[PDB]
């Protein structure tokens, strides 16, 4: 039987959540998080479902952000495997969303599970901010404005978009907090770099620009933001896939980031 990482990633992949459809992916995540003490707030905007979940009431607020939607399969004649059927071949998990970004979502859930099991008494708070419209040419903005307008301000945020080139964690992208005009302690990037170095024994390359508008918005509003996720060589393409070993590594990097920040 699978690791909980692969088991959950497979589950997510099976749900045909073509933008902006969620197809029940968020309910899967919400069930896992409800079991860990998270309060959940579902929020629909336009044709999209979103949610915000939080565990803890104390500073800092650390958040995992991402989307459940995926882009269309493209030509089925080109697909070696059924696009919405998670298909394991030679150590790789094939399917729409494997890399962008249902793999990372499963890694976020199991990392928080493992962390909350080792550190039930963690500092700070853990949040999830999940949307289903990211591949569009709205949801993030609407959720973030809701949190701001009730003075619930994310301190630090990992966006699990697939940031990597050859191997998971070889690149991460760093947001500029408030566009580079708010003070920035570097506490998040230090934590993530620390985690990536433990796992890979190599520092990631850094980009300071170029991520998603979604993450750029979170940073502009005041969060420290880092994008860290799987290899992106196959995103939005036929025969999208992810190295399963890299999903185990990413889960560890997320758990280790949590240790450094909260544990
Ligand atoms: Zn994405
Ligand atoms: Zn995408």
Author numbering: 2 to 138, 141 to 266
Can you list sentences taken from the study reporting this PDB entry?
DapE hydrolyzes N-succinyl-L,L-diaminopimelic acid to L,L-diaminopimelic acid and succinate, is part of a biosynthetic pathway that is the major source of lysine in bacteria, and is essential for cell growth and proliferation. All the DapE enzymes characterized to date belong to the M20 family of dinuclear Zn(II)-dependent metalloproteases. In order to examine the role of the catalytic domain of DapE enzymes and the role of the active site loops, we have engineered the HiDapE and the DapE from Vibrio cholerae (VcDapE) by deleting their dimerization domains. Removal of the dimerization domain in DapE enzymes renders the enzyme inactive, even though the resulting truncated proteins have structures of the catalytic domain that are remarkably similar to WT-DapE and AAP.
Two VcDapET structures were determined, the apo- and the dinuclear Zn(II)-loaded form. The two V. cholerae structures are virtually identical and superimpose with the average rmsd of 0.25 Å for 265 equivalent Cα atoms suggesting that binding of Zn(II) does not induce any major structural changes. Likewise, the structure of Zn(II)-loaded VcDapET is almost identical to that of the catalytic domain of the full-length HiDapE with rmsd of 1.15 Å. The similarity between these structures is especially apparent within the active site region of Zn(II)-loaded VcDapET as the active site structure differs by only ∼0.45 Å rmsd with the active site of HiDapET and ∼0.4 Å with the WT-HiDapE. The active site of Zn(II)-loaded VcDapET contains a (μ-oxygen)(μ-carboxylato)dizinc(II) core with one terminal carboxylate and one histidine residue at each metal site ([ZnZn(VcDapET)]), that is identical to the active site observed for WT-HiDapE. Based on the best fit, an ethylene glycol molecule was modeled in the active site resulting in a distorted tetrahedral coordination geometry for Zn1, which is bound by the carboxylate oxygen atoms OD1 of D101 and OE1 of E164 as well as a nitrogen atom NE2 of H68. Zn2 adopts a distorted trigonal bipyramidal geometry and is coordinated by the bridging O2 oxygen atom from ethylene glycol, a nitrogen atom NE2 of H239, two oxygen atoms, OD2 from D101 and OE2 from E136, and the O1 oxygen atom of ethylene glycol. The Zn1-Zn2 distance is 3.39 Å. Identical to CPG2, HiDapE, and AAP each zinc ion is coordinated by one imidazole group (H68 for Zn1 and H239 for Zn2) and the oxygen atoms of E164 for Zn1 and E136 for Zn2. Both zinc ions are bridged by D101 and a single oxygen atom of ethylene glycol (in the molecule one, chain A) and a water molecule (in the second molecule, chain B).
